[PDB]
Design an enzyme around this catalytic site. Structure first.
Site, short mmCIF file in Angstrom:
data_model
loop_
_atom_site.label_atom_id
_atom_site.label_comp_id
_atom_site.label_asym_id
_atom_site.label_seq_id
_atom_site.Cartn_x
_atom_site.Cartn_y
_atom_site.Cartn_z
N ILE A 16 14.72 13.50 9.58
CA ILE A 16 15.46 12.25 9.80
C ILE A 16 16.98 12.47 9.72
O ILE A 16 17.46 13.49 9.21
CB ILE A 16 15.07 11.19 8.74
CG1 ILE A 16 15.50 11.65 7.33
CG2 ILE A 16 13.56 10.90 8.80
CD1 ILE A 16 15.40 10.58 6.25
N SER A 18 19.18 9.20 9.45
CA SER A 18 19.74 7.87 9.19
C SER A 18 19.20 7.35 7.85
O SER A 18 17.98 7.36 7.64
CB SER A 18 19.36 6.90 10.32
OG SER A 18 19.66 7.44 11.61
N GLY A 19 20.09 6.93 6.96
CA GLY A 19 19.72 6.24 5.71
C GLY A 19 20.56 6.63 4.50
O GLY A 19 21.61 7.26 4.63
N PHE A 21 19.81 8.86 2.37
CA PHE A 21 19.76 10.32 2.23
C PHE A 21 20.48 10.99 3.40
O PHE A 21 20.68 12.21 3.39
CB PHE A 21 18.31 10.81 2.13
CG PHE A 21 17.55 10.18 1.00
CD1 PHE A 21 16.98 8.92 1.15
CD2 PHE A 21 17.43 10.82 -0.23
CE1 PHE A 21 16.29 8.32 0.11
CE2 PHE A 21 16.74 10.23 -1.27
CZ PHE A 21 16.17 8.97 -1.10
N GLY A 22 20.87 10.20 4.41
CA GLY A 22 21.63 10.69 5.56
C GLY A 22 20.79 11.68 6.33
O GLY A 22 19.56 11.55 6.36
N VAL A 23 21.43 12.67 6.95
CA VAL A 23 20.68 13.70 7.67
C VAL A 23 19.87 14.48 6.63
O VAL A 23 20.43 15.25 5.83
CB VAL A 23 21.59 14.66 8.49
CG1 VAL A 23 20.73 15.58 9.35
CG2 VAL A 23 22.55 13.89 9.38
N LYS A 39 18.33 17.92 1.49
CA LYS A 39 19.66 17.93 2.08
C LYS A 39 20.21 19.36 2.07
O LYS A 39 20.02 20.10 1.11
CB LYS A 39 20.57 16.98 1.30
CG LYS A 39 21.91 16.73 1.98
CD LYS A 39 22.60 15.49 1.41
CE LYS A 39 22.08 14.21 2.01
NZ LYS A 39 22.47 14.17 3.45
N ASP A 129 30.48 4.29 -9.83
CA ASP A 129 29.87 4.99 -8.66
C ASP A 129 28.47 4.47 -8.32
O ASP A 129 27.57 5.25 -7.93
CB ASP A 129 29.83 6.51 -8.90
CG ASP A 129 29.77 7.32 -7.61
OD1 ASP A 129 29.81 8.58 -7.68
OD2 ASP A 129 29.68 6.72 -6.51
#
Length: 295
Positions: A16, A18-19, A21-23, A39, A129
């Protein structure tokens, strides 16, 4: 993305991009059976001090409502950073699908939220954060809330406390209470507190309402007085007069039906074993990190 690796302990689920967690690459740990998100960081590239400290600080967080670190793996190309994957989509989406939650369901999630935020406050050294807007749910049929504390698209200003907009210095812990209140309100109302009812996302108008703590619970949404009171103690512009987390833990609304297993991963209905996790020693991790500086 690098090629699949360690297929002996992990199965490839889906790549994936998108989200929260990103790529990332979704995998399933064949021994623990947990779904994880991998990641990748190019070797000798971003393998800076910042990465090192994010991993170390995050490794120490072991709460059922916070996205856990699992392990770091060296591949001949990148550094692999593996962590728990929350597969239930965003809390916000569930709210939208339901229109709005009942008081009881909102309480159920708010309890988890407060337990998680309280744990972060105790464990982290420098605060400020917490991205509560993107809070996730796990895949369990009985949704466990998952806070995302990492980063290896910005949302509503409603989440931003008045002192975060105006003052140069502020207490991150008190600002987090404001954010939790925003989450509570959205759960109970199905829309954000200070943004224009629906149609316009006028940031100028939202900011204006935030600074003046101008919110109104709609007539059709019936809320208990305890609940209403809690909201009024959170939406306070002056940070020194805003209820704190420990006070929220002693609030009558929060205490009703408070489950005893809030901080436990493994319960009568939920399986979890820490010894099944790839608990690497900090020394092991640091070894891999430095060894990862070699391209």
């Amino acid at each position: 993305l690098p090629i699949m690796h360690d297929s002996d302990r992990y199965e490839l689920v889906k790549d994936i991009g998108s989200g929260n967690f990103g790529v990332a690459r979704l995998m399933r740990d064949k021994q623990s059976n947990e779904l994880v998100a991998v990641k990748y960081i190019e070797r000798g590239e971003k393998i800076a001090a910042n990465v090192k400290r994010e991993i170390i600080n995050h490794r120490s967080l072991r709460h059922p409502n916070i996205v856990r670190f699992k392990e770091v793996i060296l591949t001949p190309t990148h550094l692999a950073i593996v962590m728990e994957y929350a597969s239930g989509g965003e809390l916000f989406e569930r709210i939208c699908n339901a229109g709005r939650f009942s008081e009881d369901e909102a309480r159920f999630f708010f309890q988890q939220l407060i337990s998680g935020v309280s744990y972060c406050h105790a464990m982290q050294v420098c605060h400020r954060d917490l991205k509560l807007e993107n809070t996730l749910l796990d895949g369990s049929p009985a949704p466990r809330l998952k806070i995302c504390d990492f980063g290896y698209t910005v949302g509503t200003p409603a989440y931003i406390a008045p002192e975060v907009l105006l003052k140069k210095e502020y207490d991150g812990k008190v600002a987090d209470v404001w954010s939790c209140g925003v989450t509570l309100y959205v759960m109970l109302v199905g829309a954000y507190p200070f943004e224009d009812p629906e149609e316009p996302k006028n940031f100028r108008k939202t900011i204006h309402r935030i600074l003046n703590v101008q919110y109104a619970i709609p007539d059709y949404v019936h809320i208990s007085p305890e609940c209403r009171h809690l909201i009024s103690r959170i939406f306070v512009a002056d940070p020194a007069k805003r209820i704190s987390i420990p006070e929220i833990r002693n609030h009558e609304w929060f205490l009703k039906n408070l489950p005893a297993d809030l901080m436990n991963d493994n319960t009568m209905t939920t399986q979890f074993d820490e010894s099944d996790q790839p608990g690497q020693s900090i020394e092991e991790i640091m070894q891999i990190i430095a060894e990862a500086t070699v391209p």
